[PDB]
Ligand binder design. Structure first.
Ligand SMILES: Cc1cc2nc3c(=O)[nH]c(=O)nc-3n(C[C@H](O)[C@H](O)[C@H](O)COP(=O)(O)OP(=O)(O)OC[C@H]3O[C@@H](n4cnc5c(N)ncnc54)[C@H](O)[C@@H]3O)c2cc1C
Lengths: 292, 275
């Protein structure tokens, strides 16, 4: 099913899950056992994140076909970093010929432990270039999403420039966007209001990742650019070495965030889920969405 | 200044006030003494909720105090020419801001507000700024949130510059209304209207009010302290403060306070917010 059509039905909120590349073959089988269990939940779409800069490229195509084999709807993450325009086009074709109908067009992170993006010398620079590629080569045969940053990309120089680049990416041909994770709902609603004033009408799905360890915060603030609201931050940093209390804190905070988002009639919620972590399952149970 | 211009030019969220009207000459003078007191706060605009002779005089009086009136016009209970007449008198007085209404929040011939918006634009073009009411919680007795939103879109398309919502106690329902509006391609400013729950409850005793859902934790807090009006007051103020702090963090263009002259509720709310 195309995500644009799932969204168009307005059948209540779409719940989606994003997983991380498995470390070894037993972890891979464990992850697919988890996706098999997940089908009962009837997720809207599932994905596993892309790019060890390129990847794992044949691996990520294979994982999308395996997800489809389970009767789940894969969203293929497709990046431009570390790859020529022609390599990007090749991988794109491999996903679509494999029956992937949903693509998330992204710039992609730089390589591990490197902070500054530098384009491939014969590659794209901006995700909006990949969106335009897909639309010109496939049109409506696929449904295309992009990332959105309610608190702004760390590398942008103001929220208003950031919004203007987001509008350009939507106009290149997005059907929906999924946000970077955030912990303060008011910054998501405020992004939605900037987007509304800018006449952007596409569905924008909030992305949520419950805090599961204190060591995540540095990735969250510095790399993802998400602020941690004061009351939450206080609790976390008084409990860093009680991983039991950090987890329960993160779960509680995510439950309350998602409850408000669902009461605000968001088009769906996209959950960033560590492969082994029970954080997301606990959130869903506490919300009444999954059996205890 | 026209409200649409105040909004584009704002240096920060705009605060406006809407007073429920007085019952007697005593309460009339106290209201305008409050309004003069208010000049020090530099409110974006002020108004008084819905007898129309006195309405025009009130607008002139507010202007006389150096305040910017948002004049209310309703289609309810009057002919078309009467409506155009009150309209002309407002605009002849130098009122440049008009709120086109059927019902006039917090309260619960032309038939539709949209027809009055369209009349204003026919007669005055863009030389006035026109708002309408918005209902984040709809008319669920009556239609569907979807049908409600279609009606709002039509009213906006008649020529609104901005909307001010009916009061709400659950911010999520205001954010959900904005999201519905976004998906419908409505980009005009829409200001959240807030009334401390005390005041609303007081008001509902006296007249018919437009509905505003009371969330679980607030409804429960109210009931435990149910007798102890200074407790109940405090609960109302604390709830309105938290609502507004979240609204401002979410980049609302302003906040519109519905107030009983009269109650200490709205004064306390502004005070704790550091306004
Ligand atoms: C849901 C989600 C899933 C993700 N999955 C992955 C994944 O699988 N693999 C991975 O490596 N990363 C992934 N990412 C991370 C993402 O790749 C990074 O955050 C990256 O830094 C930004 O990607 P983007 O697609 O938004 O960048 P772009 O939209 O290309 O924007 C990058 C920068 O350029 C600016 N910009 C855009 N257009 C212009 C213009 N034309 N002129 C000047 N500046 C412009 C933007 O404002 C921004 O600062 C994901 C992020 C999200 C939110």
């Amino acid at each position: 099913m195309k995500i644009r059509d799932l969204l168009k039905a307005r059948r209540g909120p779409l719940f989606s899950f994003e997983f991380f590349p498995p470390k070894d073959p037993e972890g891979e089988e464990a992850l697919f056992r988890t996706l098999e269990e997940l089908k009962a939940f009837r997720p809207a779409f599932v994905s596993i994140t892309y790019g060890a800069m390129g990847s794992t490229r044949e691996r990520s195509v294979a994982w999308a076909q395996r997800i489809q084999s389970l009767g789940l709807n894969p969203l293929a993450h497709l990046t431009v970093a570390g790859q020529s325009r022609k390599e990007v086009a090749e991988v794109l074709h491999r996903f679509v010929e494999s029956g992937v109908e949903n693509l998330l067009a992204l710039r992609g992170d730089p390589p591990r432990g490197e902070r500054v993006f530098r384009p491939h010398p014969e590659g794209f620079r901006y995700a909006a270039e990949l969106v335009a590629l897909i639309r010109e080569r496939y049109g409506d045969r696929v449904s295309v999403g992009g990332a959105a940053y309610p608190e702004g990309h760390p590398e942008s120089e103001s929220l208003e420039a950031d919004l203007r680049h987001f509008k350009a990416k939507v106009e290149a041909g997005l059907d929906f966007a999924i946000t970077q994770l955030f912990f303060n709902n008011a910054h998501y609603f405020g992004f939605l209001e900037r987007a509304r004033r800018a006449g952007i009408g596409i569905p924008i799905l909030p992305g949520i990742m419950p805090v599961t360890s204190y060591r995540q915060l540095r990735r969250f603030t510095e790399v993802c650019g998400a602020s941690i609201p004061g009351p939450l931050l206080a609790k976390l940093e008084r409990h860093q070495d009680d991983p039991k209390a950090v987890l329960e804190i993160g779960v509680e905070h995510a439950v309350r965030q998602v409850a408000e988002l669902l009461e605000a009639g968001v088009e769906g919620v996209h959950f960033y889920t560590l492969n082994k972590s029970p954080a997301t399952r606990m959130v869903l149970e506490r919300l009444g969405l999954r059996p205890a």
